Design a binder for this molecule. Structure first.
Ligand code: ZN
Lengths: 43, 162, 97
């Protein structure tokens, strides 16, 4: 009774899918790794 | 507590003031420096709708919310105590503070549906017929967002909507 | 004094207010007086006489009213709130008659 016109993930109307707390965790973990990376890449 | 006494005698109506004894505040508050009654007793971000002993200290004999100028609560805490008190009423606690009408305990109704943490009033809610799929969902509110600042011992933040 | 003057005060015979000004608790009765002493209230009934009696020694604020159904209303000011007196006054002196 609710449709997602066309294909789910492609067009100008997409499925709304939300960001989650898990995803935020992962993103931040990976950032922290990069920060530590360029500290050691500096000198 | 000021009781107002009234008499009808010999076609004369007599009205008179009467002062009973109010309890003085407890001897030694943990945060004497503190401003608002919740805070010096160190109860901020702690009480929930479940704590009756705390809520009852602000309300009226017939069940309504007490005014703020008399209580003197930090505005934040006043709205919180309102929502808490309403949830407490709808949760069928404080059965003493319902107003007393004799005709009222006559009319049998299907025994009160036990509910708790109810945000809205029973009347105004409309049954949600449409749900909706994984991506757009209608959510049923539980508890009030005013209480979102309470301490979490689980470390896990509360679910306001389901 | 709106709530009183809106109710058509014409049904009153005599209003006497006895009070003792130097007592710390006076305000309410005084407030009541000034709501009786309003222009519109007094303009409704020209048959109603308002007498203000002041006593230093008495120590008891009191308000007495008479109205046409043969009712004598005595309210004893001690701890009574200002708006309460005007409130009970409206339901007693208007709804009755
Ligand atoms: Zn406070």
């Amino acid at each position: 009774r609710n449709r997602i016109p066309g294909r789910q993930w492609i067009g100008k109307h997409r499925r709304p899918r939300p960001v989650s707390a898990q995803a935020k965790q992962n993103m931040i973990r990976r950032l922290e790794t990069e920060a530590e990376n360029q500290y050691w890449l500096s000198r | 507590f000021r009781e107002v006494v009234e008499i009808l005698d010999g076609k004369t109506t007599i009205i008179e003031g009467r002062i009973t004894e109010t309890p003085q505040e407890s001897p030694n508050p943990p945060n004497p420096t503190g401003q608002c009654p919740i805070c010096r007793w160190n109860l901020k971000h702690k009480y929930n709708y479940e704590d009756v002993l705390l809520l009852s200290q602000f309300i009226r004999p017939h069940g309504g919310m007490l005014p703020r100028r008399i209580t003197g609560l930090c505005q934040e805490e006043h709205l919180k105590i309102e929502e808490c008190v309403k949830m407490a009423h709808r949760a069928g606690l404080l059965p003493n503070h319902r107003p007393k009408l004799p005709e009222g305990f006559v009319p049998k109704s299907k025994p009160r549906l036990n509910r708790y943490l109810t945000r809205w009033s029973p009347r105004s809610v409309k049954p949600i017929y449409n749900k909706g799929h994984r991506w757009n969902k209608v959510r049923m509110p539980v508890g009030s967002p005013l209480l979102k600042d309470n301490v979490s011992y689980s470390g896990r933040p509360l679910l306001l909507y389901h | 004094a709106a709530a009183l003057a809106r109710l058509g005060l014409r049904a009153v015979k005599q209003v006497r207010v006895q009070f003792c000004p130097f007592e710390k608790n006076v305000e309410s009765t005084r407030t009541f007086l000034q709501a009786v002493s309003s222009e519109k209230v007094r303009c409704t009934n020209l048959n109603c006489s308002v007498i203000a009696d002041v006593r230093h020694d008495g120590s008891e604020p009191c308000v007495d009213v008479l109205f046409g159904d043969g009712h004598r209303l005595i309210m004893r000011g001690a701890h009574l709130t200002a708006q309460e007196m005007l409130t009970a006054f409206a339901s007693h002196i208007q709804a009755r008659g």
